[PDB]
Design an enzyme around this catalytic site. Sequence first.
Site, short mmCIF file in Angstrom:
data_model
loop_
_atom_site.label_atom_id
_atom_site.label_comp_id
_atom_site.label_asym_id
_atom_site.label_seq_id
_atom_site.Cartn_x
_atom_site.Cartn_y
_atom_site.Cartn_z
N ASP A 25 -89.13 37.65 -64.59
CA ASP A 25 -88.10 38.65 -64.41
C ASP A 25 -87.95 39.46 -65.69
O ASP A 25 -87.14 39.12 -66.59
CB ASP A 25 -86.78 37.93 -64.04
CG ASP A 25 -85.67 38.90 -63.64
OD1 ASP A 25 -85.84 40.14 -63.79
OD2 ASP A 25 -84.63 38.40 -63.15
N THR A 26 -88.67 40.58 -65.75
CA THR A 26 -88.64 41.45 -66.92
C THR A 26 -87.30 42.17 -67.10
O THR A 26 -87.00 42.62 -68.18
CB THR A 26 -89.78 42.51 -66.91
OG1 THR A 26 -89.66 43.36 -65.75
CG2 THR A 26 -91.18 41.85 -66.93
N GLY A 27 -86.49 42.23 -66.04
CA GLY A 27 -85.14 42.80 -66.11
C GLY A 27 -84.07 41.84 -66.58
O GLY A 27 -82.88 42.21 -66.65
C1 LIG Z 1 -81.47 38.12 -60.53
C2 LIG Z 1 -82.69 38.76 -59.86
C3 LIG Z 1 -83.27 37.82 -58.80
C4 LIG Z 1 -82.38 40.12 -59.22
N1 LIG Z 1 -81.82 41.10 -60.18
C5 LIG Z 1 -82.88 41.74 -61.00
C6 LIG Z 1 -82.73 41.23 -62.45
O1 LIG Z 1 -83.87 41.62 -63.25
C7 LIG Z 1 -81.42 41.67 -63.14
C8 LIG Z 1 -81.40 43.14 -63.56
C9 LIG Z 1 -80.11 43.49 -64.27
C10 LIG Z 1 -80.12 43.85 -65.63
C11 LIG Z 1 -78.94 44.17 -66.29
C12 LIG Z 1 -77.72 44.09 -65.61
C13 LIG Z 1 -77.69 43.73 -64.26
C14 LIG Z 1 -78.89 43.42 -63.59
N2 LIG Z 1 -81.23 40.89 -64.34
C15 LIG Z 1 -80.34 39.93 -64.48
O2 LIG Z 1 -79.51 39.57 -63.66
O3 LIG Z 1 -80.46 39.27 -65.75
C16 LIG Z 1 -79.39 38.43 -66.14
C17 LIG Z 1 -80.02 37.30 -66.92
O4 LIG Z 1 -80.24 37.90 -68.20
C18 LIG Z 1 -79.22 38.87 -68.47
O5 LIG Z 1 -79.79 40.09 -68.91
C19 LIG Z 1 -79.45 41.18 -68.06
C20 LIG Z 1 -78.43 40.64 -67.05
C21 LIG Z 1 -78.51 39.14 -67.15
S1 LIG Z 1 -80.73 42.15 -59.50
O6 LIG Z 1 -80.40 43.10 -60.52
O7 LIG Z 1 -79.66 41.36 -59.00
C22 LIG Z 1 -81.40 42.95 -58.26
C23 LIG Z 1 -81.41 42.42 -56.94
C24 LIG Z 1 -81.98 43.14 -55.88
C25 LIG Z 1 -82.55 44.39 -56.13
N3 LIG Z 1 -83.10 45.10 -55.11
C26 LIG Z 1 -82.53 44.94 -57.43
C27 LIG Z 1 -81.95 44.23 -58.47
#
Ligand SMILES: CC(C)CN(C[C@@H](O)[C@H](Cc1ccccc1)NC(=O)O[C@H]1CO[C@H]2OCC[C@H]21)S(=O)(=O)c1ccc(N)cc1
Lengths: 99, 97
Positions: A25-27
Amino acid sequence: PQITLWKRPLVTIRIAGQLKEALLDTGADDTVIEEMNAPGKWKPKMIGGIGGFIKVRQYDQIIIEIAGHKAIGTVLVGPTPVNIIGRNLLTQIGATLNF
Amino acid sequence: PQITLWKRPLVTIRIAGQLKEALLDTGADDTVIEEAPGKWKPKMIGGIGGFIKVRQYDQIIIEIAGHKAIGTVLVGPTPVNIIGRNLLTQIGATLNF
Ligand SMILES: CC(C)CN(C[C@@H](O)[C@H](Cc1ccccc1)NC(=O)O[C@H]1CO[C@H]2OCC[C@H]21)S(=O)(=O)c1ccc(N)cc1
């Protein structure tokens, strides 16, 4: 490996002898796992995702093998739709995005 | 290009001349951004902290880091603009280690 994105980038991890499936999960800044058998001390922490905030147990210095590659870092334990390996451990195993 | 993961993998995107910053996100099934006309379907997407309500637009042409892509864009109160797998595949993005 080179992982294409037609399907979810799910891999097997090994964490304190247990096998789990996790999403690369690069996000994600951080690594979040639903449950784990680490004996260490931990700290309460909060983190936010797309939908709001959750409580997690922060474990530092956890050894995790991600598709054969060793990482040693922070693992957060709490409710996530799926186990996610974030950038804190992706960096360690040398993962990049390429196009 | 090769993007390392020391920092959030943010790139410039362009929609209809409109510039935004967005996260190249292998964890996201579908692209979701925060900003309007056209036909759209209701959808809910979930992650850490629960679900948000979004508007689904189909066959949107978007330019990602200079590469044209065509597909689904979800619109709603995401805290960060997110380029998901539906469009990452179209620019030939892989995760490598
Ligand atoms: C949790 C994943 C299975 C899904 N998420 C993508 C994810 O990369 C999010 C993307 C993301 C990034 C920033 C803010 C909200 C969501 N990151 C995230 O929740 O990371 C958390 C853990 O590390 C922290 O760093 C960032 C938030 C925390 S998501 O944002 O909920 C998501 C779900 C469904 C879709 N279509 C698009 C995005």
